[PDB]
Amino acid sequence: RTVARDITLLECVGKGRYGEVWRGSWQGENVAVKIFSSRDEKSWFRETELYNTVMLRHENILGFIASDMTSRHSSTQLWLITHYHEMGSLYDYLQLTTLDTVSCLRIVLSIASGLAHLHIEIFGGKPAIAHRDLKSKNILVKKNGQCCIADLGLAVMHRVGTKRYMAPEVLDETIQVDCFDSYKRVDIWAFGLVLWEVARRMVSNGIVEDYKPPFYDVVPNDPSFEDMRKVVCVDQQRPNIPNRWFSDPTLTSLAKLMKECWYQNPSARLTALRIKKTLTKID
Ligand SMILES: COc1cc(-c2cncc(-c3ccc(C4CCN(C)CC4)cc3)c2C)cc(OC)c1OC
Numbered sequence: 001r002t003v004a005r006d007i008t009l010l011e012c013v014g015k016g017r018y019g020e021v022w023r024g025s026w027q028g029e030n031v032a033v034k035i036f037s038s039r040d041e042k043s044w045f046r047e048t049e050l051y052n053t054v055m056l057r058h059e060n061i062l063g064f065i066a067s068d069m070t071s072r073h074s075s076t077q078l079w080l081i082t083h084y085h086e087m088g089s090l091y092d093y094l095q096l097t098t099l100d101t102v103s104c105l106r107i108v109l110s111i112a113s114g115l116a117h118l119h120i121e122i123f124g125g126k127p128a129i130a131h132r133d134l135k136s137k138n139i140l141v142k143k144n145g146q147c148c149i150a151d152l153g154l155a156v157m158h159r160v161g162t163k164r165y166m167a168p169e170v171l172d173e174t175i176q177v178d179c180f181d182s183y184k185r186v187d188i189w190a191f192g193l194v195l196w197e198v199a200r201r202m203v204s205n206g207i208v209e210d211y212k213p214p215f216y217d218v219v220p221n222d223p224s225f226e227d228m229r230k231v232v233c234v235d236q237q238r239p240n241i242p243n244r245w246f247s248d249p250t251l252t253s254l255a256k257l258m259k260e261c262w263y264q265n266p267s268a269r270l271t272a273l274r275i276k277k278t279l280t281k282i283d
């Protein structure tokens with residue numbers, strides 16, 4: 001039996017402290033190849049351990065293909081190989097695309113669908129999973145207008161999260177760390193922020209907001225843990241809802257939904273399944 005494993009790396013589509021992502025080719029088809037820095041080996045191990053536990057398969061979860069460890073002279077090479085989404089991240093896409101009502105709802109309901117799939121325990125099945133680093137750079141846009149959730153390097157089954165998206169209980173270190181539901185409620189906070197980022201790009205009455213990240217007006221770039229704690233915990237600020245949203249029934253409903261993801265009390269926040277149901281009744 002022939003096992004053709006060689007992947008041709010073609011173009012770098014992302015570089016950071018995590019390492020690099022490449023468009024590659026295997027047997028005539030695009031794949032995405034994440035090459036980990038030694039600094040972030042634990043993210044490869046965690047995502048590989050999760051996929052060795054449960055082979056997640058969902059239209060709104062980035063599709064797993066392979067985990068590879070290769071011995072080198074003086075180092076270990078760690079690759080994660082997935083489906084390739086040529087439209088890139090939601091963060092990328094929102095910069096220079098605006099949305100209509102149908103495309104905005106389709107994006108957010110697809111994210112909610114992927115998140116509820118992670119969060120749910122299925123018996124007889126899958127363990128419940130919290131993501132712990134949900135953000136617009138960790139969501140990819142597919143050609144059919146739905147999105148998928150990426151990067152399970154911090155996920156927990158039943159590195160810290162991106163500080164801009166951290167829930168108040170994470171910033172004030174009150175999170176109930178032994179309690180799995182706490183981690184779902186941290187994802188819901190982050191989902192609300194992503195919902196806000198997308199909703200801003202939905203046109204109503206000839207108006208749209210420019211792309212901005214959550215809290216762009218109250219924290220610096222690369223905000224510190226203290227910068228975030230002061231805004232979110234001490235002053236209890238939340239992202240602005242522009243007046244123009246209140247002329248549009250879809251954005252009026254989405255504003256209500258995002259507020260129900262942002263309660264200071266984590267147990268007051270909506271569940272991913274309740275968010276899905278609410279989105280299916282909008283429009
Ligand atoms: C090891 O490494 C890599 C391997 C491959 C790869 C290439 N051809 C064929 C395969 C294959 C799949 C599945 C079976 C099954 C068939 C039914 N039988 C009852 C059990 C066995 C056999 C062979 C694979 C897995 C790709 C890779 O990357 C693109 C690899 O590198 C990560």
Ligand SMILES: COc1cc(-c2cncc(-c3ccc(C4CCN(C)CC4)cc3)c2C)cc(OC)c1OC
Pocket residue numbers: 026065066
């Ligand atoms: C890793 O990824 C890819 C792998 C392959 C691939 C290559 N050789 C063989 C296979 C295979 C054959 C047969 C079985 C059996 C298992 C049990 N039996 C009861 C029925 C089915 C399983 C596996 C596959 C899946 C193709 C891919 O794409 C076309 C892959 O994706 C990029």
Ligand SMILES: COc1cc(-c2cncc(-c3ccc(C4CCN(C)CC4)cc3)c2C)cc(OC)c1OC
Pocket residue numbers: 013014021032033034080081082083084085086087088089092137138139140150151152
């Ligand atoms: C968030 O995280 C992961 C993401 C991915 C991933 C999957 N498909 C496509 C991409 C991508 C492709 C292309 C662009 C650009 C470049 C071409 N053009 C100039 C504009 C568009 C951006 C992004 C990525 C980055 C894979 C991962 O692992 C293998 C990730 O980590 C888990």
